[PDB]
A = this chain, B = another copy of it.
Amino acid sequence: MDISLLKQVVQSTNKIALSTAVNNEADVKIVNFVWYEAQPDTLYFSSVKTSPALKVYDQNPDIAFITIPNDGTAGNPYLRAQHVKLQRSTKTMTDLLPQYLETVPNYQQVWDAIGSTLVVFELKLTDLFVDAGVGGEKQTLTFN
């Protein structure tokens, strides 16, 4: 399946508003994420193992998200999804760290401070809306 538009948009964001509805309580948090073209249906993020958040996340709820463009990126591009499966990943932060360092400003100091306490989660997509923004195209993708 042709993920070129997804690739166009994901290049200019490194964070999502990640929302939950466990026990019918709305919550939204902004977290950084990383993404790899070989596994295009998956976004990865990490949380501190003592955080109240990681506590909702470990119930493996279905979640919604929307990306936020990097500072300096005009045009309003974004990705948006609901019914996203959420679970702990087999990837570790050691696996993901190069991509974090490449894409998330000042992440080295975060890793150095709290890295050993981070747990990796993955977000598995079914349907995804993709909008390249001003001058660009829009589509939906559905992953198997």
Taking Cβ atoms with an 8 Å cutoff, the residues of A that contact B are 17-30, 61-66, 68, 71-72, 74, 78, 80, 82-84
The count of identical subunits is: 2
Cβ distance A33 to chain B, nearest Cβ, rounded Å: 14
Q: Which residue of B lies closest to A134 (CB)?
A: B106
A65: which B residues are within 8 A, CB to CB? Answer: 28
Contact A66 B29 (CB under 8 A): yes
A62 to B21, CA, bound (A): 9
Known: A19-B17, A21-B21. A26 touches B63 (CB 8 A): yes
Contact B64 A28 (CB under 8 A): yes
Contact A71 B74 (CB under 8 A): yes
Interface residue from B24, B68, B78, B83 paired with A21 (Cβ < 8 Å): B24
